[PDB]
Design an enzyme around this catalytic site. Structure first.
Site, PDB file in Angstrom:
ATOM      1  N   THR A  61       2.145  90.287  58.742  1.00 45.90           N
ATOM      2  CA  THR A  61       2.717  90.943  60.147  1.00 45.90           C
ATOM      3  C   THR A  61       3.279  89.733  60.861  1.00 45.90           C
ATOM      4  O   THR A  61       4.128  89.854  61.782  1.00 45.90           O
ATOM      5  CB  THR A  61       1.611  91.733  60.885  1.00 45.90           C
ATOM      6  OG1 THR A  61       1.098  92.771  59.962  1.00 45.90           O
ATOM      7  CG2 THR A  61       1.995  92.075  62.298  1.00 45.90           C
ATOM      8  N   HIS A  84       2.586  96.221  60.843  1.00 46.58           N
ATOM      9  CA  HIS A  84       1.341  96.263  60.460  1.00 46.58           C
ATOM     10  C   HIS A  84       1.391  96.337  58.951  1.00 46.58           C
ATOM     11  O   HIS A  84       2.001  96.690  58.097  1.00 46.58           O
ATOM     12  CB  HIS A  84       0.279  97.624  60.771  1.00 46.58           C
ATOM     13  CG  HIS A  84       0.760  98.516  60.416  1.00 46.58           C
ATOM     14  ND1 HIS A  84       0.288  99.239  58.883  1.00 46.58           N
ATOM     15  CD2 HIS A  84       1.073  99.936  60.856  1.00 46.58           C
ATOM     16  CE1 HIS A  84       0.774 100.352  58.735  1.00 46.58           C
ATOM     17  NE2 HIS A  84       1.312 100.833  59.708  1.00 46.58           N
ATOM     18  N   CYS A  85       0.656  95.256  58.312  1.00 45.77           N
ATOM     19  CA  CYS A  85       0.105  95.078  56.807  1.00 45.77           C
ATOM     20  C   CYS A  85      -1.052  95.802  56.668  1.00 45.77           C
ATOM     21  O   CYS A  85      -1.132  96.916  56.763  1.00 45.77           O
ATOM     22  CB  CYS A  85      -0.031  93.680  56.795  1.00 45.77           C
ATOM     23  SG  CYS A  85      -0.636  92.334  57.935  1.00 45.77           S
ATOM     24  N   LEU A  86      -2.177  95.069  56.231  1.00 44.48           N
ATOM     25  CA  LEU A  86      -3.478  95.519  56.209  1.00 44.48           C
ATOM     26  C   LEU A  86      -4.248  95.117  57.296  1.00 44.48           C
ATOM     27  O   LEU A  86      -4.733  95.893  58.017  1.00 44.48           O
ATOM     28  CB  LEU A  86      -4.091  95.339  54.765  1.00 44.48           C
ATOM     29  CG  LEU A  86      -5.234  96.175  54.062  1.00 44.48           C
ATOM     30  CD1 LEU A  86      -6.372  95.010  54.237  1.00 44.48           C
ATOM     31  CD2 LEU A  86      -5.595  97.415  54.897  1.00 44.48           C
ATOM     32  N   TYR A 142      -3.712  98.129  59.748  1.00 45.35           N
ATOM     33  CA  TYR A 142      -3.394  99.411  59.143  1.00 45.35           C
ATOM     34  C   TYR A 142      -4.408 100.581  59.643  1.00 45.35           C
ATOM     35  O   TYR A 142      -5.593 100.562  59.654  1.00 45.35           O
ATOM     36  CB  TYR A 142      -3.543  99.646  57.589  1.00 45.35           C
ATOM     37  CG  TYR A 142      -2.839 100.425  56.799  1.00 45.35           C
ATOM     38  CD1 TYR A 142      -1.784 100.237  56.137  1.00 45.35           C
ATOM     39  CD2 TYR A 142      -3.116 101.870  56.743  1.00 45.35           C
ATOM     40  CE1 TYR A 142      -0.837 101.037  55.268  1.00 45.35           C
ATOM     41  CE2 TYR A 142      -2.369 102.836  56.450  1.00 45.35           C
ATOM     42  CZ  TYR A 142      -1.220 102.431  55.480  1.00 45.35           C
ATOM     43  OH  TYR A 142      -0.323 103.457  55.006  1.00 45.35           O
TER      44      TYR A 142
END
Ligand SMILES: Nc1nc2c(ncn2[C@@H]2O[C@H](COP(=O)(O)OP(=O)(O)O)[C@@H](O)[C@H]2O)c(=O)[nH]1
Ligand SMILES: [Mg+2]
Lengths: 360, 180
Positions: A309, A301-303, A183
């Site tokens: 992802t 994207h995630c975190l 992220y």
């Protein structure tokens, strides 16, 4: 002789680097020629780095350095700032204060990043195993430290001016699947580089897997909603999807512009995928894949950019070749970004369930 | 045909590398490459004698003081260089380079070279020196330093215009195959 020039480099960065960190535009415009000649910090620093080009064993560390010294700073590669009477001197002489100031900032961040080389050299001073792996550079733009989220330097994404961003191109069985990253960091420069990549790479779409709740507790910038302008890039994104509740998916339409250039891109924001967990049902994962499906690769994207992802990308593979070996996919992904790709067990289970259902 | 080894030294950035590349390839460097150490070669006929010339590029920075000397063994002739538009690089000819070279190369010939001839009469360069209360090194001054250190010759040149380049190396060879 390899050991002594290794020590020339260590002692040289230890004292040259803190000097470049204290540079100011005015003091520099007035003293560039001195800094770029004789025993000055800029020239002396570039010479010390050349030392590693003489040691075949430092291959990995050398590719790393070469990348940093080829980044554009004025209208030239950083490495050309180590000499007098050439293009940089001509440029610096007539640069406007505004231009000089932006160039000075790049030197600050590159100088700081170069301390990672100092760190590798100190390890060799003790137990000396020439490292065979070096994460790519982050220049203050990455959200997490590389010691916690490493970045394969061979597959790292690079902008047209030489700037590396915190994103990798994942590949399986010989072909690329998508661009994966963490992220974006809440910074003008971090955010600008991100948008810049979307259009230069002409990504088919942008996928976001963090919930509202997480974006809150962690305070993650909702840059894919309204309109903003970072550096020289502006963004216009309008919500195209449904009502209010049951936010399975929110679709947007994004228009990007960098100079005279524009690009349109669809945005899919997943809202019910909890961190460290699978989606509510196999059907949902299967449907999300067809949606996303509907150069020219999706950016996800995630975190952290490793769990959810990974799972999302693997599902894209299954859609086209449902017999694909999921063990091989995980292995190829890890070799494309880092060893945390697809680290959550429960999600790997959901993937095998999608495989089975699909062959049914 | 014989072989001759020539070593090139002097303060950092006085133009050692540009000088060597222009002479061997007939083209000025397209970009800047920091030198740690390097080797170049050339085939030339001087006064009717075919010669294969061996050239050795070095590092002028002081943290390389202990590594640079590894290049001096078996040298046939040395070139000590200083920029005609940098008085501090000129003072270091007597304070450092002369003493280092004579110590490692007991007794072979030294040629003193003034570089960047094309910038001595350049207004923008002159006005820049004027500020720091400085001025370019003149031909008479160079000759005077040459005699002070025992050099067999004083020569000026420019890598950019290539003027005087050929002569430096013809004279470097000549000093080695020179009669009593
Ligand atoms: N005008 C001008 N510039 C020169 C000449 N030679 C070298 N230069 C410039 O000065 C810099 C230093 O030269 P270089 O050969 O790298 O110096 P070295 O450090 O002694 O090897 C180069 O980047 C060139 O732009 C010259 O004959 N005329
Ligand atoms: Mg050099």
């Amino acid at each position: 002789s390899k050991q002594p020039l290794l020590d020339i480099a260590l002692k040289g960065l230890k004292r040259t680097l803190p000097q470049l960190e204290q540079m100011d535009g005015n003091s520099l415009r007035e003293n560039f020629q001195e800094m770029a000649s004789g025993n000055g910090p800029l020239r002396s620093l570039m010479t010390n780095l050349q030392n590693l080009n003489k040691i075949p064993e430092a291959k990995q560390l050398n590719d790393y350095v070469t990348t940093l010294t080829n980044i554009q700073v004025g209208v030239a590669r950083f490495s050309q700032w180590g000499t007098c009477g050439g293009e940089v001197e001509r440029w610096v002489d007539k640069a406007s204060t505004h231009e000089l100031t932006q160039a000075v900032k790049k030197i600050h961040v590159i100088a700081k990043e170069l301390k990672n080389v100092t760190a590798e050299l100190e390890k060799i001073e003790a137990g000396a195993p020439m490292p065979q792996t070096m994460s790519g550079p982050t220049l203050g733009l990455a959200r997490f430290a590389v010691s916690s989220i490493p970045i394969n330097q061979q597959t790292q994404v690079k902008l047209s001016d030489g700037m590396p961003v915190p994103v990798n191109t994942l590949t399986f069985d010989g072909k690329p699947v998508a661009l994966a990253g963490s992220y974006p960091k809440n910074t003008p420069d971090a955010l600008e580089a991100h948008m810049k990549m979307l259009l230069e790479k002409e990504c088919s779409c942008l996928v976001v897997l963090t919930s509202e709740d997480q974006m809150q507790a962690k305070q993650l910038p909702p840059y894919f909603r309204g309109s903003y302008t970072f550096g020289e890039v502006h963004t216009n994104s309008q919500k195209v999807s449904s009502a209010s509740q049951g936010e399975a998916i929110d679709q947007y339409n994004m228009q990007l512009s960098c100079g005279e250039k524009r690009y349109t891109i669809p945005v899919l924001h997943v809202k019910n995928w909890p961190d460290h967990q699978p989606l509510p049902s196999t059907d949902q994962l299967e449907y999300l894949a067809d949606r996303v499906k509907n150069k020219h690769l999706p950016m996800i994207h995630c975190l952290g950019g490793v769990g959810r992802t990974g799972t999302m990308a693997a599902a894209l593979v299954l859609k086209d070749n449902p017999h694909s070996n999921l063990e091989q996919v995980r292995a190829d992904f890890r070799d494309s970004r880092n060893n945390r790709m697809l680290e959550d067990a429960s999600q790997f289970v959901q993937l095998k369930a999608m495989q089975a259902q699909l062959l049914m | 045909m014989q072989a001759i080894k020539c070593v090139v030294v002097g303060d950092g950035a006085v133009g050692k590398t540009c000088l060597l590349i222009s002479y061997t390839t007939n083209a000025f460097p397209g970009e800047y490459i920091p030198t740690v150490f390097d080797n170049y070669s050339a085939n030339v006929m001087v006064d009717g004698k075919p010669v294969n010339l061996g050239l050795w590029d070095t590092a002028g920075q002081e943290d390389y003081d202990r590594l640079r000397p590894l290049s001096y063994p078996q040298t046939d002739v040395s070139l000590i260089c200083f920029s005609l538009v940098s008085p501090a690089s000129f003072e270091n000819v007597r304070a450092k380079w002369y003493p280092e070279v004579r110590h490692h190369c007991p007794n072979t010939p030294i040629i003193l070279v003034g570089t960047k001839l094309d910038l001595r009469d350049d207004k923008d360069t002159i006005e820049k020196l004027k500020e720091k209360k400085l001025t370019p090194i003149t031909y008479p001054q160079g000759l005077a330093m040459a005699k002070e250190i025992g050099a067999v010759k004083y020569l000026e040149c420019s890598a950019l215009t290539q003027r005087g380049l050929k002569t430096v190396f013809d004279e470097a060879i000549r000093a080695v195959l020179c009669p009593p």
